[model samples]
Target: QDQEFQEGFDGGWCLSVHQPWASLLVRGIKRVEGRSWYTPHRGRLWIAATAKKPSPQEVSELQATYRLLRGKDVEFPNDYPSGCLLGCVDLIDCLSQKQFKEQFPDISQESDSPFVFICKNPQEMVVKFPIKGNPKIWKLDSKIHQGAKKGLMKQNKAV
Candidate 1:
């Protein structure tokens, strides 16, 4: 089962990002994912929301930041779902800080990481499935993959 799923998703790689950010990424609000290192893989990458809950202050601060970036008020999720597969996005490029700055001069100072992962075409799962998360990039569990796939299908149908 894992092998088949891996073949479908180029090894079925998944990345665990902390809440709010994870939700933002899947919702297509956040496009640049800052990281210390770069990833060679460039394709559909599943995203999992980690179990770490953010404080109210942290949430408010980020919401303010996002509002500034977007130039308007942004609606945030009432509840940040954790320890689950939220969705997948196309990991198109991993750019260094300098490269990112050169490309996006306006928002160059937005990220602090040495490397930034550029993502596009985010697809959120209609129904989130609970799963354990790893520190870095890891393979998606077959069970989780199956549920996530179904959720994606449901979302597509709804749209």
Candidate 2:
């Protein structure tokens, strides 16, 4: 997470919706004329061209350039044992910048609980956390926001 992206999304998760899916959702939302759950305090949003190969898209989108808003910037727990119990990933999880070779024998491997949101547009797609918490993509609205209505009508209609 860069500073600009963090500033905008620190309050929540940011998901980069693929183009067609996002466009359809947006259109459906507008027809319904509902408000986006996008809150500055708990806001989590991002948009991308594709779902597969997100890293390159993220980097490319970063270059596209958008006004990334500032966020509250969440922190993670420091205590290794306590943090691990709370679904927190180990901080020293990686040996280098782009690699995580093997899991430790006894020490539990840390999951990528990074609060980072990967989108096609890196500049526009990054998020910031307000405080220390689980940073997995699961906490993102796509998973957490079940109470709210999602715009995918074609989904349940199948079953």
Candidate 3:
């Protein structure tokens, strides 16, 4: 839509995460991302679903955690589209384990604390095609980048 949004999506690093979390990121359902470490990099970030599917233990833990805290059950799809660049969003802030708990107490759990990434104003955009994914932050090809841009443009216009 605008130069800033286009540039942010076009030339930004992506965080590769497993399903449920990745889907939550794109869906704007999960706003705070928990990690064991912190990063100096902030601002725009792309959402890429890694090839690894969530293990049974992970799914159980996540579903249990949500049910306990939020009093809601989360159902994850059996088949997750993997190794794909799904969408992009902004990385607005990073908070310590304590601060995150204080800020997002409802979503916070015993194991969720760490380096919590506080995200907002999610601009979801699927590439409409697959792009190979890798660990950590990696480069996004022009095709995927521009496709995400196009999706965002369409979203903005609809809004």
Candidate 4:
């Protein structure tokens, strides 16, 4: 099952997410992505920050929400970079809100959406380049994909 995910990821699967959530996801501060619909795909999912920038008020509200849920201060990127591939994470599973709360009580919280996409092992890219994003999961440009792969390798080697 894990092998299948790696193969799928190698095919260049990518998802566009709005920031600061995109930053949070890649930073491993946010573990679950809530959505109205469910996804069948799972693997080393690449995350691209959308072009839209959130308002200051929205950013404050999000920070408050995370602080309340996590019971501690959550650091956010000082500047949210838009329209870029921020990083990647392992998409381990998708579960119902009910199942998520029941199984992952420590991490689960009420969400507007019914489905939750569970993610793990976040890996932020060492370098980010501008890229137009799509609404749904999309294939990354081959050149950008190669760049991201190399970025990850550089970070891994440094560690």
Candidate 5:
């Protein structure tokens, strides 16, 4: 007997193509070159136009990170910045892999990029909401630096 067939869950994909208003992107230096397997980047990470396409290099960097987690019941995606450079993948705060593992106590491996990591076990891996830190302070040498808000640290108005 064939009961009425039904879909288990919402199965679909979301595609967004946004058009950004032309704005000036503040160019800066490459933060760090990647230096480990199962890491974030393998090359330069330039401070690109705040609202630009992920360059081949940037895409390559992201791909390196994605390859690490996609192998074990998990996946990593660069899902930020829908259609504008104003909100590109450069606005989240991070600690280096060294600092992150120090905090996690469970992750074991040298990673390239800075991130907030998580792992319930080898079977369960997660990195929740991976965003970026303010690029303006990349030159600073202190964790006490300010968030990109308020006066001097004000986020460049993306709109």
Candidate 6:
């Protein structure tokens, strides 16, 4: 998995978002990420969990929103893992507000103004360790990165 993680991040970037949703992404339960701003960058992307712990209300609202949008009533685990590089995916494309509205009519109404991320090939928990996240997309050293990969391989294999 070190080889896979190393090569995927050769020239890629990372994104930090709130939990539950971030977990959903890695679990391949959610594909589209809602953002207010648009990003022109498209390629391999890493999924990081922000240190910011969401309020209970926010969690409830998020769980409800997920069910409403994806039609999957999910009892999201309360783990709320934070400050970690949990997984990754390909940022295939970003959709404008209009395009997002038309394509995901059910979820469009969920957010005020949604700029959707079209993601693909989600890789969950390739690195099991919790990595501190940065405000902006950041890079990780290969050695440190491989360490996390080794942890994941061990943890996953044991399961």
Overall lDDT per candidate, in order of appearance: 0.78, 0.24, 0.64, 0.80, 0.27, 0.68
Q: For residues 73-159, what per-residue lDDT tens digits would candidate 5 score against the true structure?
A: 322323434222121123222346777657645433433454532211011012111123343213211221122111132232221
Q: Which residue segments of model 3 deviate by more than 4 Å? A: 1-10, 54-79, 152-159
Candidates 1 and 3 compared: the better one by TM-score is 1
Off by over 4 Å in 5: 1-49, 56-61, 70-99, 108-159
lDDT of 6 at 115: 74
> Which one wins on lDDT?
4
**lDDT, candidate 6, 61-110, per-residue tens:** 87787776666654455566778777776887789888878876865664
RMSD of each: 4.8, 19.4, 5.3, 3.4, 18.3, 5.9
Residue-pair clash count for candidate 6: 0
lDDT tens digits, residues 89-146, model 3?
A: 6777778978777776766663365787876666655344566677666777766666
Task: State the lDDT of candidate 4 residue by residue for 52-73, as single tens digits.
Answer: 8899898888878877775565
**Best-to-worst ranking by lDDT:** 4, 1, 6, 3, 5, 2
TM-score of each: 0.84, 0.18, 0.69, 0.85, 0.25, 0.70
| Model 6: ten consecutive residues of lowest lDDT | 150-159
In candidate 2, what are the lDDT values of residues 85-104, reduced to their tens digit?
A: 11111111122212222332
Candidate 3 minimal-lDDT segment of 10 residues: 150-159
lDDT of candidate model 3 versus the reference:
0.64
Which residue runs does candidate 2 get wrong by more than 4 Å? Answer: 1-12, 27-42, 51-159
Write model 1 residue lDDT over 67-125, tens digit each, in one string.
78765755666667888888888887788999999998987776879998888878887
| lDDT at 80, model 5 | 31
